[PDB]
């Protein structure tokens, strides 16, 4: 189904966007982006989870 294919293609794009950091070293500032990137991926995870779940049950 057209919609589902489009939805998955989009979720993939959301993971492609906001990818791993740099990497760059700086005291406590290196671990600062870990917090940032974890938060962002934890979010994408649940969004994708929800988006897909609507195309099933």
């Amino acid at each position, epitope marked *: 189904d057209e*919609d589902l294919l*489009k*939805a998955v293609r989009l979720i993939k*794009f*959301l993971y492609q*966007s906001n990818p791993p950091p740099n990497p760059e070293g700086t005291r406590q500032a290196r671990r600062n982006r870990r917090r940032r990137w974890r938060e962002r991926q934890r*979010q994408i995870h649940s*969004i994708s989870e*929800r988006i897909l779940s*609507t195309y099933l049950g």
Partner: antibody
Amino acid sequence: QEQLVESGGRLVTPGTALTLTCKVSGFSLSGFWLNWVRQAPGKGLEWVGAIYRGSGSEWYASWAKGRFTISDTSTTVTLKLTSPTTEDTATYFCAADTTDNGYFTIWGPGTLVTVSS
Amino acid sequence: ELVMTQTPSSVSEPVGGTVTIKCQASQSISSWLSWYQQKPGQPPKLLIYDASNLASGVPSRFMGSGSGTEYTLTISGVQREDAATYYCLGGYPAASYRTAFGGGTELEIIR
């Protein structure tokens, strides 16, 4: 600092295609959701569709599909009314989702489309 | 194909008085819900996003909640300003049922 302004709202004859424009400006964020919402004279809000910015991910509503075309660009988002009818008279809005949690944080002031003979 | 069932159509209430607007979801919608106030000839303003949290600026008297398919906006100690139409927005644009609007509830302040 973010902002949205719509233009292109004008009186048109029926079937005579119009194109609406939304001037996206000040968004630190790369790609996001940009939705089109209409509101006819003294009526409720109706979501028309949306687009994910960084891609070409067009999403329309049950009624809108076909007669509508959302087009993302550098600067900026458009809405084409392929075959307008009198029932399309409304003020169209563009609204951004700066969080990607299906909610319109920033709105445009609107632009009035008028479909009449 | 997702539908929002906003109740009531209109509502009158004095200052101090409390208001309750209800939205009835036609499908799932997790925190896939937001509440908006719209004063005449003005673009809507977000009050409550992700069903229960208030946008910045929005005063404490604005309360959001929901239980699976029932969502409630609760303006507690209503003030003169709050006089406006109110909409709820449910879903995500990314289908399968897209995102849909409440359909309004006009609030008349009583003096």
